[PDB]
mmCIF file of C-alpha atoms and ligand atoms in Angstrom:
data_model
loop_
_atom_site.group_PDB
_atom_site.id
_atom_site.type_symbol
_atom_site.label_atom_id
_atom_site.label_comp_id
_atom_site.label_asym_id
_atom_site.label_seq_id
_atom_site.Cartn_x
_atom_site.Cartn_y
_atom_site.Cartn_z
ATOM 1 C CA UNK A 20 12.644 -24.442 13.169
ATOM 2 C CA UNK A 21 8.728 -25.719 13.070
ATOM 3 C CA UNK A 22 8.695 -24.154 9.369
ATOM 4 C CA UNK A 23 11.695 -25.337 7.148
ATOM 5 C CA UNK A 24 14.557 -23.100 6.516
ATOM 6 C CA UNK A 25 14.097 -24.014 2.761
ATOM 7 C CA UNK A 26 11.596 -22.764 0.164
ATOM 8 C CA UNK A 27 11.249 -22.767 -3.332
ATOM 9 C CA UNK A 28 11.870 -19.954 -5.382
ATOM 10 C CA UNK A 29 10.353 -20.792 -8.837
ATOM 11 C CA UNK A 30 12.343 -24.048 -9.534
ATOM 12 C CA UNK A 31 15.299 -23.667 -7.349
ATOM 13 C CA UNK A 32 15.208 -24.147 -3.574
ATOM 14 C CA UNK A 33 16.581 -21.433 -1.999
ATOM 15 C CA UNK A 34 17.521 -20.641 1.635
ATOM 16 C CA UNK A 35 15.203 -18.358 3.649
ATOM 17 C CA UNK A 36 17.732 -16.284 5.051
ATOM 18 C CA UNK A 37 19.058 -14.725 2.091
ATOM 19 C CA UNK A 38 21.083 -11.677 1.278
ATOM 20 C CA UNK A 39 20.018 -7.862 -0.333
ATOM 21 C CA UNK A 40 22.751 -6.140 -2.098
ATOM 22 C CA UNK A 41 21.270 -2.658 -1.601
ATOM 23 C CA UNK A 42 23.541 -1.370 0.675
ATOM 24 C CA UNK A 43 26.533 -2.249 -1.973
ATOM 25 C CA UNK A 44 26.365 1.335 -3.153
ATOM 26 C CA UNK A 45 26.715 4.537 -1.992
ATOM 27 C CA UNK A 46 24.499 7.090 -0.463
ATOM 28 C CA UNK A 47 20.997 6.996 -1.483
ATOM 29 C CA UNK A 48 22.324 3.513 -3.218
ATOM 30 C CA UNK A 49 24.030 5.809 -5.925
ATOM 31 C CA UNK A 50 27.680 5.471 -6.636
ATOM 32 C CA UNK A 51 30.263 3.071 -5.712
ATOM 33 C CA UNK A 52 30.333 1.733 -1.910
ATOM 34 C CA UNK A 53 32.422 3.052 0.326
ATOM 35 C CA UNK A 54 35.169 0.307 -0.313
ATOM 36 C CA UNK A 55 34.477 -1.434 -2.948
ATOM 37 C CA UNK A 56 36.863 -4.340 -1.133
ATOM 38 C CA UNK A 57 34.653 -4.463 1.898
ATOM 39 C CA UNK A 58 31.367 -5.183 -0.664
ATOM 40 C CA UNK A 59 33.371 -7.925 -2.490
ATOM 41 C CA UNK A 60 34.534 -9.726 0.985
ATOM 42 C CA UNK A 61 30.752 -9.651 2.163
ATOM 43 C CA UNK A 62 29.225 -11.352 -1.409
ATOM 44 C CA UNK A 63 31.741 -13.845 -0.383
ATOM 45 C CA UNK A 64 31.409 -14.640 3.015
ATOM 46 C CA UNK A 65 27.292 -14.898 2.219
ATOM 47 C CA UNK A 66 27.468 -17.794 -0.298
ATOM 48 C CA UNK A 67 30.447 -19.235 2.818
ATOM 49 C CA UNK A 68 27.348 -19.192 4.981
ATOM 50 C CA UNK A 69 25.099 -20.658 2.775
ATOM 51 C CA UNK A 70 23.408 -18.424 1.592
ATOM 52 C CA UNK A 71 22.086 -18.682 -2.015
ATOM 53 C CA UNK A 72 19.732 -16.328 -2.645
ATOM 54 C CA UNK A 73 20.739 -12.259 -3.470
ATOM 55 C CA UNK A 74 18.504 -9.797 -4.117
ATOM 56 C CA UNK A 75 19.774 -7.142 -6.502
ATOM 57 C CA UNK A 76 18.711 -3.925 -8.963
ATOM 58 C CA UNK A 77 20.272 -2.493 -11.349
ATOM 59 C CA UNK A 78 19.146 0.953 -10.671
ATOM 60 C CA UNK A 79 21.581 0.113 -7.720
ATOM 61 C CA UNK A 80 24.091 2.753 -8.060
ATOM 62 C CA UNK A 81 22.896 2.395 -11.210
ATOM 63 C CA UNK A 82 25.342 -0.495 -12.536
ATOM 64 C CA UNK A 83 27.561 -0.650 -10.120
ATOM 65 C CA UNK A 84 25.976 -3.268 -7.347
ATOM 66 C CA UNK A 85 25.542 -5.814 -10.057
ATOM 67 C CA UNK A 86 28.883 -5.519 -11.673
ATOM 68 C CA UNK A 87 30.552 -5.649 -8.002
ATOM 69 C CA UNK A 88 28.334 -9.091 -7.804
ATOM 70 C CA UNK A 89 30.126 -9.880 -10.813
ATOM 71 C CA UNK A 90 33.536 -9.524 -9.687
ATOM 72 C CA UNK A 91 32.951 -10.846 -6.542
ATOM 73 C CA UNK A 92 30.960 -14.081 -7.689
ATOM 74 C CA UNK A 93 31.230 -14.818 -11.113
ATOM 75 C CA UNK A 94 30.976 -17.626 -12.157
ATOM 76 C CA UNK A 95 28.049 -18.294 -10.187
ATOM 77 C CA UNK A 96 26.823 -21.993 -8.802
ATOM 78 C CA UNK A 97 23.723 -23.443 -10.026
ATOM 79 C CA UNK A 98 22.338 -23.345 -6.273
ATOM 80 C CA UNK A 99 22.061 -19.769 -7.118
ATOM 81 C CA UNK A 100 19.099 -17.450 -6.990
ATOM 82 C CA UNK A 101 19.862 -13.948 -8.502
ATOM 83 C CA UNK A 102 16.804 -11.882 -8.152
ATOM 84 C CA UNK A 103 16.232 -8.177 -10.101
ATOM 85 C CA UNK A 104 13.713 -5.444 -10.330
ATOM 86 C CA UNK A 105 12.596 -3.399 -12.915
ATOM 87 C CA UNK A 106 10.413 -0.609 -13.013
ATOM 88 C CA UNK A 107 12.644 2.344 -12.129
ATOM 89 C CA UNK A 108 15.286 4.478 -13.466
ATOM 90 C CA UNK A 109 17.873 7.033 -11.334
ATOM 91 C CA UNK A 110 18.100 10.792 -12.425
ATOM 92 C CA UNK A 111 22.002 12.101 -12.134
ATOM 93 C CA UNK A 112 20.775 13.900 -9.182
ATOM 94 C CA UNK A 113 20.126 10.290 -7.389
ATOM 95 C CA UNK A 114 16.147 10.603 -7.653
ATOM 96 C CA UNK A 115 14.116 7.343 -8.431
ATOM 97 C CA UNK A 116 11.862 7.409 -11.768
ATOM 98 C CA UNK A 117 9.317 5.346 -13.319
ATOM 99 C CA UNK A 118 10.785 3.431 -16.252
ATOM 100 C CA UNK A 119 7.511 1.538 -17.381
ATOM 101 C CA UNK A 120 7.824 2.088 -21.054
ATOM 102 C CA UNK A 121 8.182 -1.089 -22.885
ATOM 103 C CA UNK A 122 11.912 0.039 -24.399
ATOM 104 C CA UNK A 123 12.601 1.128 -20.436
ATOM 105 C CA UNK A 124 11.912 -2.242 -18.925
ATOM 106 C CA UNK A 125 13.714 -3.866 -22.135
ATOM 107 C CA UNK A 126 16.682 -1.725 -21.969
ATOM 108 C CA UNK A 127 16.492 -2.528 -17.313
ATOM 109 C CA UNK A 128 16.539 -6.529 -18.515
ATOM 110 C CA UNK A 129 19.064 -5.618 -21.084
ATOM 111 C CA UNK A 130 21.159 -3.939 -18.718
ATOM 112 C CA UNK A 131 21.305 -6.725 -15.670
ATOM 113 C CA UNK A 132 22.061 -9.738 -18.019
ATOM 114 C CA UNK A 133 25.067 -7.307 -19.312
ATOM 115 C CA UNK A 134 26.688 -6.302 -15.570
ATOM 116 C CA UNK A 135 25.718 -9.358 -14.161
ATOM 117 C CA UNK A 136 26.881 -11.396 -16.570
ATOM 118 C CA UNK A 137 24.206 -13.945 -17.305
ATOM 119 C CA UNK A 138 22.587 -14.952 -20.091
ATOM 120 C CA UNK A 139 19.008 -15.779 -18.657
ATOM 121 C CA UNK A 140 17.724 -13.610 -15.385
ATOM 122 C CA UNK A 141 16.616 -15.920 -12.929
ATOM 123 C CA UNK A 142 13.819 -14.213 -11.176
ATOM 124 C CA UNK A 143 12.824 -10.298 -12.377
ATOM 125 C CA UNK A 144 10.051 -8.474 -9.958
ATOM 126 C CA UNK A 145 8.299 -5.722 -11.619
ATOM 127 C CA UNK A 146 8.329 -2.844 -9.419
ATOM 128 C CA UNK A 147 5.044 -0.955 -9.612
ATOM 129 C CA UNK A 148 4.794 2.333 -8.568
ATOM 130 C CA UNK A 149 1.381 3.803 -8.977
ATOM 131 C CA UNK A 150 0.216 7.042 -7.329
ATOM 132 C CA UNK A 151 2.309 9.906 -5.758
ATOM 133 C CA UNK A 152 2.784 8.256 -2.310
ATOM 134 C CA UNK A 153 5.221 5.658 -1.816
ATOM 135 C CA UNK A 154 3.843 2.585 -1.102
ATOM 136 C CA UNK A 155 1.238 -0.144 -3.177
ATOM 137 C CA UNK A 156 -1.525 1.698 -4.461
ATOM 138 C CA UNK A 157 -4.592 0.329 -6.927
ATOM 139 C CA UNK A 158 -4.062 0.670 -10.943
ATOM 140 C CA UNK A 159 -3.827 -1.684 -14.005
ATOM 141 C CA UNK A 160 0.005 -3.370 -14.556
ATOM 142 C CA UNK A 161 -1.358 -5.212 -17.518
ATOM 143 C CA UNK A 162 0.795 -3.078 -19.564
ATOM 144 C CA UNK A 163 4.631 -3.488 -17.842
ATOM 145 C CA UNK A 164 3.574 -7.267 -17.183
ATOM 146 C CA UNK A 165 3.078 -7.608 -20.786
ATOM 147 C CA UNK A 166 6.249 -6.572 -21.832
ATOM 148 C CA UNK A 167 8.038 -8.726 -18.880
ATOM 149 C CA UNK A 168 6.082 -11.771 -20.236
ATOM 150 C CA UNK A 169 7.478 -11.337 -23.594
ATOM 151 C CA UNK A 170 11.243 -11.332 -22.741
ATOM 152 C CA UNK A 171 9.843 -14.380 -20.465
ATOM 153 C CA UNK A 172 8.912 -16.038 -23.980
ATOM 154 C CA UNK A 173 12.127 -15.124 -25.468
ATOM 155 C CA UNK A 174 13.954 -16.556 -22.936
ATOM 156 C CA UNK A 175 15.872 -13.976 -21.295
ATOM 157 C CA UNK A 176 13.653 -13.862 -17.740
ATOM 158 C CA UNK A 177 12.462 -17.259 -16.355
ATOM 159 C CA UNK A 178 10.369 -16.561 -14.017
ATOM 160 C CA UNK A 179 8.884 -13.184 -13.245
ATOM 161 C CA UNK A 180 8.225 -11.453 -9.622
ATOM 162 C CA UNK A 181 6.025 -8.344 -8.663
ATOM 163 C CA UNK A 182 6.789 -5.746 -5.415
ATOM 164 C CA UNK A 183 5.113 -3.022 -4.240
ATOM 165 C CA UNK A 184 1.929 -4.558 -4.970
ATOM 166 C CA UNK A 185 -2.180 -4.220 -3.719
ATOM 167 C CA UNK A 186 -3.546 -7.968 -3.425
ATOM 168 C CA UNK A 187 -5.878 -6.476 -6.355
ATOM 169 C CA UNK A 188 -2.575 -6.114 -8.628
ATOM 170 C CA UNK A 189 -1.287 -9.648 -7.961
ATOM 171 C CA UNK A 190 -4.164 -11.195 -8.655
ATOM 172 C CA UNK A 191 -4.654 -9.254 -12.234
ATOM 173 C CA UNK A 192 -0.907 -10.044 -12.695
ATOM 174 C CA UNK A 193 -2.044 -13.881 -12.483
ATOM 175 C CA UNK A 194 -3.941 -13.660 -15.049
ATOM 176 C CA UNK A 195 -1.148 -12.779 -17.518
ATOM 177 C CA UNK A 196 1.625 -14.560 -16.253
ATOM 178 C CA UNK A 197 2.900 -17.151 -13.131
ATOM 179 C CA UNK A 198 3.918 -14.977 -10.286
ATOM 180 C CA UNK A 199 6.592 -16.555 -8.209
ATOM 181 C CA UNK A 200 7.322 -14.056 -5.398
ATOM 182 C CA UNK A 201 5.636 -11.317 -3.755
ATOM 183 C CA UNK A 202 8.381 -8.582 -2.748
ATOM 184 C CA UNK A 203 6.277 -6.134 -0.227
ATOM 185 C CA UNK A 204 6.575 -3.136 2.770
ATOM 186 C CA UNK A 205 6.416 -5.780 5.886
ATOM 187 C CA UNK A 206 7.654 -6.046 9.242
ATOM 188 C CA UNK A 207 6.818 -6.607 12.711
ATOM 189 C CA UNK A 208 5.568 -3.428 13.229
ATOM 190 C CA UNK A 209 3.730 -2.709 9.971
ATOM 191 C CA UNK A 210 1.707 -5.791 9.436
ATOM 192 C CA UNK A 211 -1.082 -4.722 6.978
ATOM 193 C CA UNK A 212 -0.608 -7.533 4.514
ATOM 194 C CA UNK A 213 -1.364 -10.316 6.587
ATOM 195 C CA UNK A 214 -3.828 -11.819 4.802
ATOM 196 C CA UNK A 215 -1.923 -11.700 1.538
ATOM 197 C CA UNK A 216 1.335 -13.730 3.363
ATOM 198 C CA UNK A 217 -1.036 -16.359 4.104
ATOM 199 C CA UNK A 218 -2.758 -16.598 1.214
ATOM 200 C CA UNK A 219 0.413 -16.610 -1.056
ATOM 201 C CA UNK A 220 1.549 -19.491 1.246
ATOM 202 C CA UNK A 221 -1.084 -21.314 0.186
ATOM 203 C CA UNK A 222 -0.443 -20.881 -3.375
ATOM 204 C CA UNK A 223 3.288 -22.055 -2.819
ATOM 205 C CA UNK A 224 4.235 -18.001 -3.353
ATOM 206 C CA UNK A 225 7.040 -16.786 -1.895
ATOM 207 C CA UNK A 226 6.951 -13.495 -0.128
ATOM 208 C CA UNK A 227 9.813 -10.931 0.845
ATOM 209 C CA UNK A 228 9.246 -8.359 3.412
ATOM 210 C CA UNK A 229 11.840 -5.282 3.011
ATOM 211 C CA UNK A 230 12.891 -3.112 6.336
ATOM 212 C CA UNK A 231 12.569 -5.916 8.893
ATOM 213 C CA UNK A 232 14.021 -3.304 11.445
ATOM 214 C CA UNK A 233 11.977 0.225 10.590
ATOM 215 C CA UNK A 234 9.379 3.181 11.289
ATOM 216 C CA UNK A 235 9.420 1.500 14.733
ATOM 217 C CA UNK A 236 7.769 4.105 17.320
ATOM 218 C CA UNK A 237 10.269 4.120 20.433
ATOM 219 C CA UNK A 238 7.817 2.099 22.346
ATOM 220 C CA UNK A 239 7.870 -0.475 19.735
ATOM 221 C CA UNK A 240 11.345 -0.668 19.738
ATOM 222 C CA UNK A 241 11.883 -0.306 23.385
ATOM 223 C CA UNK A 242 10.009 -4.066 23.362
ATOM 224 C CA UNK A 243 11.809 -5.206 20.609
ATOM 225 C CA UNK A 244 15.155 -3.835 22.588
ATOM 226 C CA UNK A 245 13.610 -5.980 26.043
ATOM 227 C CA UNK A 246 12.882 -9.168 24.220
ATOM 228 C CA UNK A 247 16.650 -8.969 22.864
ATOM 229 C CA UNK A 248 18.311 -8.566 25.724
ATOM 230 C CA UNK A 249 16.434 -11.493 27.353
ATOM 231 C CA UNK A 250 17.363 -13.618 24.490
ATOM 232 C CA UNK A 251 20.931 -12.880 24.351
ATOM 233 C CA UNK A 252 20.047 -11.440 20.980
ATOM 234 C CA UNK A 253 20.208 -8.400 18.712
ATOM 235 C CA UNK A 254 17.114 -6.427 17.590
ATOM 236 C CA UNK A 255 18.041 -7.440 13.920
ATOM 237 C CA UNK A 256 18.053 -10.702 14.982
ATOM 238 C CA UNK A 257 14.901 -11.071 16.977
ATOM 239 C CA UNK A 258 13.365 -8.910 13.829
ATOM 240 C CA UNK A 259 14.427 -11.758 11.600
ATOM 241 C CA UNK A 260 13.837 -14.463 13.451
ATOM 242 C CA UNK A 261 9.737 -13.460 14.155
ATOM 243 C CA UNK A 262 9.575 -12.872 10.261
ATOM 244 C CA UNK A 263 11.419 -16.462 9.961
ATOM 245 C CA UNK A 264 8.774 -18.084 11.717
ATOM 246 C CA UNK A 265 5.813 -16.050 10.878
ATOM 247 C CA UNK A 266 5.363 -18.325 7.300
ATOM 248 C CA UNK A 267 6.860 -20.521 5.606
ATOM 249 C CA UNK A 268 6.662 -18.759 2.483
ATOM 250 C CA UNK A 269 9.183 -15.552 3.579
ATOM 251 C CA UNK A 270 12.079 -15.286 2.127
ATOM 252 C CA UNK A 271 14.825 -12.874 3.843
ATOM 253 C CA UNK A 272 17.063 -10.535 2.350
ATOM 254 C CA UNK A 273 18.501 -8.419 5.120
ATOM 255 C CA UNK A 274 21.390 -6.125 3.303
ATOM 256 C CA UNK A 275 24.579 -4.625 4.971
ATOM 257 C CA UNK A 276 27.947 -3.516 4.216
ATOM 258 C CA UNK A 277 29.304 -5.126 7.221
ATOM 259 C CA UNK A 278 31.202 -8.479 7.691
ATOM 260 C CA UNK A 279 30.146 -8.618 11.473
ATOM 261 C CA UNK A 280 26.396 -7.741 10.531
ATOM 262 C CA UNK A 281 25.762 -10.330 7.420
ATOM 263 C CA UNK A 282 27.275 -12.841 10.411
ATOM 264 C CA UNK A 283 24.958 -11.682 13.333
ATOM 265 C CA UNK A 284 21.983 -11.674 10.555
ATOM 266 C CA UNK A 285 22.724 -15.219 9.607
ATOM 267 C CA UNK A 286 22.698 -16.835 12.882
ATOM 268 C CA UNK A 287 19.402 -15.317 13.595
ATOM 269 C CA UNK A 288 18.555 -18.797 12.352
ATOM 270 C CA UNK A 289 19.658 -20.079 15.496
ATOM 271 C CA UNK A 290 17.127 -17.718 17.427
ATOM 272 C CA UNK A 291 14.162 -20.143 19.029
ATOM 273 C CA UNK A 292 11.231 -17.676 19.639
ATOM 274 C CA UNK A 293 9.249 -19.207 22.495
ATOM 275 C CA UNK A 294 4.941 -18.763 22.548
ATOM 276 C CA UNK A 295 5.813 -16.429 25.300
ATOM 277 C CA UNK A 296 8.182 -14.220 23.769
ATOM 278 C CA UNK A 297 5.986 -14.838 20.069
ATOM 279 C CA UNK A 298 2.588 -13.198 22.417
ATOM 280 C CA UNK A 299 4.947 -9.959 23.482
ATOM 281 C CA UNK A 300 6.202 -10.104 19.410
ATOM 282 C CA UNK A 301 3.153 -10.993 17.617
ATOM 283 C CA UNK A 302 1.240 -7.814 19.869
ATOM 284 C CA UNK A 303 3.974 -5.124 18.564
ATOM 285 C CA UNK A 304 2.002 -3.612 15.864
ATOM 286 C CA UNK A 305 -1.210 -3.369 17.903
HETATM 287 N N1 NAP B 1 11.540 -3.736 -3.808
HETATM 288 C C1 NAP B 1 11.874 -2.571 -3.258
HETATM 289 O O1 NAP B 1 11.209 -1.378 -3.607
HETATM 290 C C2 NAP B 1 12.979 -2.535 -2.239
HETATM 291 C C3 NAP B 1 13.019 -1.523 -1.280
HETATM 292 C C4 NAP B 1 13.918 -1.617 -0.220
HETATM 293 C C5 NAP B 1 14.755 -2.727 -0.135
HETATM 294 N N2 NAP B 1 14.714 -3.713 -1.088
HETATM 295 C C6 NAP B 1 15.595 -4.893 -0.974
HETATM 296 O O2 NAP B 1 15.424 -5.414 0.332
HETATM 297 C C7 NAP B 1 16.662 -5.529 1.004
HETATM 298 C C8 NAP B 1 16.478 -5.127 2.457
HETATM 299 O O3 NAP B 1 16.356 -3.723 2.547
HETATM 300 P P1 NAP B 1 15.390 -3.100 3.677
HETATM 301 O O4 NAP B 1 14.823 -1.799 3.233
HETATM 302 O O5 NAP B 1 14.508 -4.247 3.982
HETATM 303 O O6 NAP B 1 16.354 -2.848 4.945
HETATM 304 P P2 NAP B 1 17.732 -3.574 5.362
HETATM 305 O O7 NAP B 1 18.585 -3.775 4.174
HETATM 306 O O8 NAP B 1 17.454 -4.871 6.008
HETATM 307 O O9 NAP B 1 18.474 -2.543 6.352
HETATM 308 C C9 NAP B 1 19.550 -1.773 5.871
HETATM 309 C C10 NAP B 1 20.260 -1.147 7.066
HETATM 310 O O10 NAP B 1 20.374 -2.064 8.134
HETATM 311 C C11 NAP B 1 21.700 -2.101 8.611
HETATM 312 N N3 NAP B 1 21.955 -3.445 9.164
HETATM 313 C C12 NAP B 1 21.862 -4.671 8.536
HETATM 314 N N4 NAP B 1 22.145 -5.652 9.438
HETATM 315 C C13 NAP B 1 22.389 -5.061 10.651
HETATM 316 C C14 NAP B 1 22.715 -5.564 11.907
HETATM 317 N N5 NAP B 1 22.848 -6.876 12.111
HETATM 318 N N6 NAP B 1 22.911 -4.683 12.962
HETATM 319 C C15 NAP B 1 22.776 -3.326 12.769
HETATM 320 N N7 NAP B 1 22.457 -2.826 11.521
HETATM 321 C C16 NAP B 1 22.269 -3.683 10.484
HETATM 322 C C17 NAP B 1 22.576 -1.683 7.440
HETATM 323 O O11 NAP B 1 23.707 -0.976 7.859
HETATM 324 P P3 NAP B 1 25.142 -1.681 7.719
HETATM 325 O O12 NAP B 1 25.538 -1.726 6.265
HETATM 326 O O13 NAP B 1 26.153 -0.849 8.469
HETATM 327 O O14 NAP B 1 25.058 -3.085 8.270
HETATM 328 C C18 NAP B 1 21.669 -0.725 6.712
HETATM 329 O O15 NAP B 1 21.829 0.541 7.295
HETATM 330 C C19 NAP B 1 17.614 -4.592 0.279
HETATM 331 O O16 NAP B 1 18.949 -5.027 0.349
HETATM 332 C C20 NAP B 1 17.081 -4.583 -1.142
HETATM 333 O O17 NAP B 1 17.728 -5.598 -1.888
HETATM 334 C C21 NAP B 1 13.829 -3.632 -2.121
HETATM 335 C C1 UEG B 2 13.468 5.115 -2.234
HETATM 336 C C2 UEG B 2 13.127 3.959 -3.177
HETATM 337 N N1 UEG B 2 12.272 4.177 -4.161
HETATM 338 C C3 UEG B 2 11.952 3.204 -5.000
HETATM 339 C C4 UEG B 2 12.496 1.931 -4.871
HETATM 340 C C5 UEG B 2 12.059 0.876 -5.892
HETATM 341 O O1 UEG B 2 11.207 1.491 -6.824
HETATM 342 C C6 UEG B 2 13.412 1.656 -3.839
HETATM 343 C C7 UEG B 2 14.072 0.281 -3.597
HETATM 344 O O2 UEG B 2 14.091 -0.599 -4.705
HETATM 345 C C8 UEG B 2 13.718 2.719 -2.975
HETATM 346 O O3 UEG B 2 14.617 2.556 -1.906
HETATM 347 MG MG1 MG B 3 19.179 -3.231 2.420
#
């Protein structure tokens, strides 16, 4: 706990261990969950553990994730923090499209204020998808950003987000609009923006790493695996306890479907990481 377990998310403060609704759908996040009960008991026993920050889509099932967030949660506190994404579309056969055009990313805002119920979106990230290959890759958002800065002057977004994003991309987003959060590829094992985390920090950016536990290589998490079990801990939570501490700035939103899970994920903030175990940690990715 040398970095606070607080940080502030636009205007509100939110808490850094936070909850993604991803999994609240079903395979390839398309369709209902498995049991739709199950999703509504976890929503619940998140905001029970304080959390107050969820991290949601739309193009989640399409529909379905929000309006379960609905059920579950409405009316929502002022403590908190809904956070969408725009940017993409599903085909019927589950596939993931670009939805850029100004009447897509209209219709995406449309669409989340309806299911979730809200009148004014909290936080929207612009999802960028440039290039063929999956990650951030170089290329003007002018365009998309645009658009999102409208609806911002209309009122309907408040404060606007990007992910999937080259440092090159957030920095020409700046320029049209404040950026609040930085929603990025990161873990312990794949640590290529760096740089950018600390950078943001310094700005007073929030960033949010997604797949905390992922394309580890056996020997990486074989160490992961040893520092757990000397800890007491689970992989998870050693995974989200290094990103805890790594900045300030990162906010978590670790997703499951699982009661037991969202519980073992939250008291990763319990976790102390000592210099020791940070120096076997910290030399993962190289
Ligand atoms: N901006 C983007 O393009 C984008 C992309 C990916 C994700 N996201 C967001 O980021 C959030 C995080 O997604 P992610 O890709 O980073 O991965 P993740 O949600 O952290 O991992 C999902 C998987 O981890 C499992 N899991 C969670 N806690 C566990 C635990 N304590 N022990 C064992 N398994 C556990 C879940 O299974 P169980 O359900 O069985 O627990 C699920 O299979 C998502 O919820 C989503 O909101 C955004
Ligand atoms: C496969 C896949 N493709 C695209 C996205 C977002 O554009 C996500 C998550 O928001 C994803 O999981
Ligand atoms: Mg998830």
């Amino acid at each position: 706990h040398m970095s606070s377990n607080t940080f502030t998310l636009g205007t509100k403060s939110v808490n850094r261990l936070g909850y993604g609704a991803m999994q609240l759908a079903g395979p390839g996040v398309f369709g209902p969950p498995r049991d739709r009960h199950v999703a509504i008991t976890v929503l619940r026993e998140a905001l029970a553990l304080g959390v107050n920050h969820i991290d949601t889509s739309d193009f989640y099932g399409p529909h379905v994730t929000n309006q379960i967030i609905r059920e579950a949660l409405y009316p929502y506190s002022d403590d908190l923090t809904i956070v969408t994404k725009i940017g993409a579309r599903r085909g019927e056969d589950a596939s993931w499209l670009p939805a850029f055009s100004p009447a897509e990313l209209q219709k995406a805002v449309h669409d989340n204020l309806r299911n979730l119920g809200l009148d004014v979106l909290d936080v929207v990230n612009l999802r960028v998808m440039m290039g063929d290959g999956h990650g951030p890759a170089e290329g003007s958002i002018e365009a998309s950003l645009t658009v999102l800065a409208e609806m911002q002057q209309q009122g309907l977004v408040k404060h606007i987000g990007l992910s999937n994003v080259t440092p090159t991309q957030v920095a020409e987003a700046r320029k049209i609009a404040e950026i609040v959060c930085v929603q990025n590829e990161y873990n312990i094992a794949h640590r290529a923006d760096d740089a950018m985390i600390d950078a943001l920090a310094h700005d007073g950016i929030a960033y949010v790493p997604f797949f905390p536990l992922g394309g580890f290589t056996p020997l990486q998490s074989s160490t992961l695996s040893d520092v757990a079990a000397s800890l007491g801990a689970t992989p998870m939570q050693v995974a989200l306890a290094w990103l805890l501490q790594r900045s300030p700035n990162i906010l978590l939103i670790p997703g499951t479907s699982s009661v037991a899970h969202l519980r073992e994920n939250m008291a990763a903030e319990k976790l102390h990481l000592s210099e020791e175990v940070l120096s076997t940690l910290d030399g993962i990715s190289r």
